[PDB]
């Protein structure tokens, strides 16, 4: 507990672990830039906060993409619009809504709500989203801290962009259900995922140590049962049947979600100019840490292709959990 690093929450070991892994990744994939951070789930304390090279973690905003799907599902579970076993028809991977096309990376057919998170189905997210009102979803976005600049002592923290809900066309509700047409910082996403980690409670995320006397507390964004169920689904993502098996951590149960943001061109999107982000938590089912990683405009994918962030999450999570003397919870 107490030591010379007090009263900052940043652990020199975890910060160093976070810096070597992120920097190694940015260099190995000849990327423009990277950001990563670790949050203690029980306290909302930031254990590490790393940019390689300026503070883009707090300043840079992007379309979160598929990282938003667990929050689409979180809300739908929490409003009793679906259960984890509810069936969602995604057919052949091509669907049309108000004349706009929505596409999966393949034809997943009949998925469960869990299946939609595991396979990262845009079509599945959209159809779950269509069971809810814009206002309901905007309130949840606002409840998890989106559209609001974090107050952590850093002037110029980005607020990101959230269209007001009374302006939402049904197709924007769709795009937002799979993380397009809103912008967030990596910091906002890390904080938002603490609400899934901490059984539905949004923890204040702080660079200062909290008191055991008056433990930190936050708004109840989701029921605890909602949060455990999304945690089971995040774990399914990093199985052989999920889209992010490259996030798996030898020795530990982990769960997380990947997303991709492409360079906007006013109305279109550029080719191979993208941002690979990953947010998760470990060990499951009761996480100690949330870890968020973002690698901007990588150019040498190698064996990982576009999914370059998952293995950086993996390395930081194992090193950090070892550094915390957390015992392996997996064979």
Please identify which residue in the block is written with the tokens 């299946």: 115
Task: End-to-end CA distance of the chain: give it in Å, rounded.
Answer: 30
SS3 307: coil
Is 12 one of the annotated active-site residues of the chain?
no
- Cβ-contact 140, 75 below 8 angstroms: yes
Q: What is the DSSP letter of 211?
A: P
Q: CA angle 300-63-216, nearest 5°?
A: 110
Q: State how far the Cα of 52 lies from the Cα of 31, in Å rounded to an integer.
A: 10
What does 89-109 look like in DSSP terms, one character per residue? E-TTSEEEETTEEEE-SS---
Count of positions (residues) in the chain: 331
**Of residues 9, 66, 277, 314, which has the active-site annotation?**
66
- Cβ–Cβ under 8 Å, residues 136 and 75: yes
Q: Which of 157, 131, 155 lies closest to 145 in space, CA to CA?
A: 157
Measured CA to CA, the distance from residue 32 to residue 55 in angstroms comes to: 14
Q: Give the dihedral of Cα atoms 107, 179, 71, 167; nearest 10 deg.
A: -120
* Rounded distance between C-alpha atoms, residue 68 and residue 188, angstroms: 12
Q: Which helix (H) or strand (E) holds 134?
A: helix 134-143
User: Are 267 and 287 in contact, with CB atoms under 8 Å apart?
Assistant: no
**Could you give the C-alpha distances from 284 to 83, 87, 117, 169, 245, in angstroms and in order?**
20, 25, 16, 37, 15
Distance, CA of 218 to CA of 227 (rounded, Å): 15
Residue carrying structure tokens 């010379």:
4
Catalytic residue numbers, as ranges = 66
């Amino acid at each position: 507990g107490p030591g010379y690093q007090d009263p900052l929450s940043i652990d020199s070991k975890i910060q160093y672990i976070t810096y070597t892994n992120l920097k190694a990744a940015v260099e190995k994939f000849h990327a423009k830039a990277g950001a990563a951070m670790v949050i203690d789930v029980q306290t909302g304390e930031v254990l590490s906060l790393v940019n390689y090279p300026r503070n883009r973690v707090l300043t840079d905003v992007f379309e979160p993409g598929s990282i938003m799907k667990p929050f689409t599902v979180s809300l739908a579970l929490d409003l009793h619009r679906v259960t984890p076993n509810t069936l969602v028809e995604t057919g052949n991977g091509h669907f049309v809504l108000d004349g706009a096309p929505i596409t999966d990376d393949s034809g997943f057919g009949t998925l469960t709500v869990g299946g939609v998170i595991q396979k990262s189905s845009n079509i599945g997210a959209t159809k779950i989203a269509m069971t809810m009102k814009p206002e309901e979803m905007w309130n949840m976005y606002t409840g998890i801290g989106l559209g609001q600049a974090p107050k952590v002592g850093f002037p110029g923290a980005a607020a990101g962009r959230l269209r007001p809900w009374k302006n939402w066309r049904r197709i924007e509700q769709a795009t937002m259900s799979y993380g397009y047409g809103l912008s967030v910082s990596l910091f906002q996403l890390a904080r938002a995922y603490t609400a899934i980690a901490h059984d539905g409670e949004l923890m204040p995320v702080t660079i200062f140590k909290t008191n055991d006397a008056q433990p930190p507390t936050g708004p109840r964004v989701f029921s605890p049962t909602t949060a455990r169920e999304v945690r089971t689904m995040l774990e399914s993502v990093v199985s052989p049947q999920g889209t992010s098996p490259n996030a798996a951590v030898p020795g530990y149960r982990v769960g997380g979600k990947s997303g991709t943001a492409y360079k906007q061109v006013g109305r279109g999107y550029d080719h191979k100019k993208y941002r690979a982000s990953f947010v998760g938590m470990a060990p499951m089912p009761n996480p100690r840490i949330v870890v968020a990683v973002s690698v901007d405009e990588p150019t040498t994918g190698g064996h990982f292709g576009g999914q370059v962030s998952g293995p950086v999450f993996s390395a930081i999570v194992g090193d950090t959990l070892r550094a915390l003397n957390v015992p392996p919870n997996m064979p």
